[PDB]
Amino acid sequence: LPPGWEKAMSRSSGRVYYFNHITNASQWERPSEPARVRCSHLLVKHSQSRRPSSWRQEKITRTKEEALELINGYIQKIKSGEEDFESLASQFSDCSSAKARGDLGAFSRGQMQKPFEDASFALRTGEMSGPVFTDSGIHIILRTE
Numbered sequence: 001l002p003p004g005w006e007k008a009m010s011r012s013s014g015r016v017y018y019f020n021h022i023t024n025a026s027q028w029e030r031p032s033e034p035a036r037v038r039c040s041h042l043l044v045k046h047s048q049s050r051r052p053s054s055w056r057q058e059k060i061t062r063t064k065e066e067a068l069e070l071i072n073g074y075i076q077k078i079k080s081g082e083e084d085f086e087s088l089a090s091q092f093s094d095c096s097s098a099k100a101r102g103d104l105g106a107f108s109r110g111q112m113q114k115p116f117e118d119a120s121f122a123l124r125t126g127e128m129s130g131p132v133f134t135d136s137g138i139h140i141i142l143r144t145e
C-alpha cells in the first residue's frame with residue numbers, strides 16, 4: 001500500500017477499509033514522490049488558532065471541537081456530492097485563499113507547516129484529505145496537480 005495507508009476493520013459493518021495516517025483520509029476501496037504538488041484547502045480556525053481572526057470573522061471564538069465538527073460536515077457534503085470543495089472553500093474557509101476557491105498554487109517540500117506539507121505530498125492527484133491539524137487550525141486538503 002502507498003505511503004501512509006493501512007488496513008482497518010469497519011466497526012459498523014465489519015467490512016475492511018483503508019485509512020491514511022498522514023492525510024487522515026479513509027475509504028472502502030484499496031488505494032491505487034513528485035518535486036512539486038498543487039493543492040487547494042478549506043481552513044476552519046478556532047480559538048486556539050495561532051491567529052484567532054480571519055476575513056470571515058474578526059474574533060474567532062468557536063472551540064477546537066466545534067471546528068472539527070464543521071470540518072466533518074464539509075467533508076460529508078463534499079463526499080456525498082451535495083456541495084463541491086471550491087464552493088465550501090469560497091464560502092467557509094478562514095484562509096483568504098477562499099477568494100481563489102481555496103487554491104494555493106504549486107509548492108515543493110520546504111515551504112508549508114509540516115503536517116500540511118506531508119498530507120499534501122501523500123495525496124494522489126485528485127485526492128482529498130481528512131481533517132489535518134496545524135497551528136492555524138483544521139484543514140481539508142485537495143490535491144489538484
Ligand SMILES: COc1ccccc1-c1ccc(C(=O)O)o1
Pocket residue numbers: 041043050051095096104112113116134135136
Ligand atoms: C495554506 O495555508 C497554510 C498551510 C499550512 C499551515 C498554515 C496555513 C495557513 C494559511 C493561513 C493561515 C493562518 O491564518 O494562520 O495558516
